[PDB]
Design a protein around this ligand. Sequence first.
Ligand SMILES: [Cl-]
Ligand SMILES: [Cl-]
Ligand SMILES: [Cl-]
Ligand SMILES: [Cl-]
Ligand SMILES: [Cl-]
Ligand SMILES: [Cl-]
Ligand SMILES: [Cl-]
Ligand SMILES: [Cl-]
Ligand SMILES: [Cl-]
Ligand SMILES: [Cl-]
Ligand SMILES: [Cl-]
Ligand SMILES: [Cl-]
Ligand SMILES: [Fe+3]
Ligand SMILES: [Fe+3]
Ligand SMILES: [Fe+3]
Ligand SMILES: [Fe+3]
Ligand SMILES: [Fe+3]
Ligand SMILES: [Fe+3]
Ligand SMILES: [Fe+3]
Ligand SMILES: [Fe+3]
Ligand SMILES: [Fe+3]
Ligand SMILES: [Fe+3]
Lengths: 178, 178, 178, 178
Amino acid sequence: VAQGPNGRALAESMNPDLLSAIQQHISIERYASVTYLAMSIWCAERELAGFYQFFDGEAKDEQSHAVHFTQYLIARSQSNDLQTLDAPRQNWDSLASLMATAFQMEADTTSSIQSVYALAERNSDTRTTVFLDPLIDAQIQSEDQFAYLLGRVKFANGDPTALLVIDNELRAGQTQRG
Amino acid sequence: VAQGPNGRALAESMNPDLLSAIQQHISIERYASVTYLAMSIWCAERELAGFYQFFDGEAKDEQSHAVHFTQYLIARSQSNDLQTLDAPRQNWDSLASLMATAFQMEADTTSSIQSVYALAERNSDTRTTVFLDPLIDAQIQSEDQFAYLLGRVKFANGDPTALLVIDNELRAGQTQRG
Amino acid sequence: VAQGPNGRALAESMNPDLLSAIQQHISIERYASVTYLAMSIWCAERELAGFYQFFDGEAKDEQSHAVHFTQYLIARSQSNDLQTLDAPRQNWDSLASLMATAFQMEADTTSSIQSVYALAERNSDTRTTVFLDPLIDAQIQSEDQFAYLLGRVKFANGDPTALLVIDNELRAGQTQRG
Amino acid sequence: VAQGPNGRALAESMNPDLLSAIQQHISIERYASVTYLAMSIWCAERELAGFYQFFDGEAKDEQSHAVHFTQYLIARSQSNDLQTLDAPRQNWDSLASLMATAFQMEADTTSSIQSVYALAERNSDTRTTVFLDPLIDAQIQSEDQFAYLLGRVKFANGDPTALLVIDNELRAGQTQRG
Ligand SMILES: [Cl-]
Ligand SMILES: [Cl-]
Ligand SMILES: [Cl-]
Ligand SMILES: [Cl-]
Ligand SMILES: [Cl-]
Ligand SMILES: [Cl-]
Ligand SMILES: [Cl-]
Ligand SMILES: [Cl-]
Ligand SMILES: [Cl-]
Ligand SMILES: [Cl-]
Ligand SMILES: [Cl-]
Ligand SMILES: [Cl-]
Ligand SMILES: [Fe+3]
Ligand SMILES: [Fe+3]
Ligand SMILES: [Fe+3]
Ligand SMILES: [Fe+3]
Ligand SMILES: [Fe+3]
Ligand SMILES: [Fe+3]
Ligand SMILES: [Fe+3]
Ligand SMILES: [Fe+3]
Ligand SMILES: [Fe+3]
Ligand SMILES: [Fe+3]
């Protein structure tokens, strides 16, 4: 039995470029987390309590995704390399602008997973494509959800009254089309 | 065993300037109470039932704070001196103006506690600083809450529709960021 | 009513040096979080499942502490500034060495809080000292707990049998003297 | 409607090389089953009751996997061909050696599935890749589990005391990192 780079018994070796791509993707999930924390704060500063609660939860969920990836590297007997984390964006001129950045962050997270997926396919790493499949499915749902929240905020067209109504929807847990 | 100014057994004497400051602070709590009663009435007169219910409760809570302080003076064997109570402000041109006065009243209540706290420290009265610590913590929460309500009302920008939505939030007990 | 640096109504201004110190302390809590994540991974790589579960939870708790501080800055109408986060230490020669780093991380977190506390006192910021008091109390308990775990691991004197027994204690939730 | 090789209505023909590969893989699952039975016996002979119970269950689960594959061939209207089954390995010099063989057996089971998967892709058999996807996911978990058990036994470094502790873990159902 061979030993993997992290010292555990090795079921099958992993291409170093694929390993590097997964380590970088963990940083993307961690960066999404701190970005949603920054967004939660921006909303709290403007008394948008439902948006604050929503993004507070999204921050925790993205961190959970990051940990899920670190566990996959452990399972593959590969080394983890937790990286320096950039500071998030923290300033927006409007809730609509913030929600556009949020949607872009979600779509960019999917693009990162897609890049890992394509590298796994080039390397015939079926364990990794199987691992990523349900994460892509979750991303479809999250993109659908963020398009819904962004579109509803844009429909409000900057009217504070409409934004208060949507804020109360989010506080109540009404965060997707259903 | 020595007898304190109120006749009870005396655990430790209290500086008369500190005693006077606590008696004055009790008046500040009582004045906050009648101010919030006046605000509850102003809101009721304009059919803002959620704001009326909110300030009705705040009036009762501030009175409870006043009584809590009178009990501390009893516990320290110090005399209470219930003072003449000024009439509250009763007229405002808008809900936003009323909420600004409410926030100022809350911040001024904290400033009064801080002044007592500093006098207690100058006199090495550790019982009094310990007594005040949780009251300062409550004040942080109340300032956060009043900044939230004031900010939400200001966001409404005088639109009656938005103010009705917020009024219904308060009636439902949705009074802070959560 | 004045507006604070984050735009909310301002109960009382905060010294900019104290604000900077709190923002830096939030980074210390976030760094403790990612350090405990790195430690959880190191333990998982060596099949120390109880230590992995323990540090996984500590990572989540430290993140919660960081968010708790960001909420205090919101409550004080002060700006948050989420900073770049250093990569954690990730390599140790033994569990005893890892636990020494963990204890040091906990003690250093307390030292950071103490530095903020002293600055708040120099500035007569009683809200901040009151806010920090229960966090210092939690730190006493955490230092006691980490001294217990470190001491128990050192008592094992590198014997794998003893380390398996302690690992099973942690998996069962037996993590302090009780 | 066409009839498949097993006589049932045929939704889509299957490449004979892919069919042969699935029939061979069923033998691999059956061989894993009897191998884990042999390991359960070896452990029972040495009073390692927790390891005996663990491998007894693994033997039953691998047989269930084999039957799951036979049901897929039925669903595809393909013939099953149950093959002669080799005798398992039955002798090991130590529990660590046995656990290495167990890990290798698990990794080799995954390699067999991967070989079927690649053949299905070459033949554009999307039903078969979809069928195999959750089985690969289960294999990731089983490889992670067997790496954990092997690593814990190796950490024991042949100390009977440590092996008794781990044996009791397995009897209690504590068989993975959790
Ligand atoms: Cl920014
Ligand atoms: Cl907007
Ligand atoms: Cl951006
Ligand atoms: Cl008046
Ligand atoms: Cl108004
Ligand atoms: Cl006034
Ligand atoms: Cl390192
Ligand atoms: Cl050690
Ligand atoms: Cl260090
Ligand atoms: Cl043999
Ligand atoms: Cl052994
Ligand atoms: Cl063999
Ligand atoms: Fe994510
Ligand atoms: Fe996401
Ligand atoms: Fe009060
Ligand atoms: Fe008050
Ligand atoms: Fe902390
Ligand atoms: Fe800590
Ligand atoms: Fe306290
Ligand atoms: Fe199997
Ligand atoms: Fe298996
Ligand atoms: Fe799938």
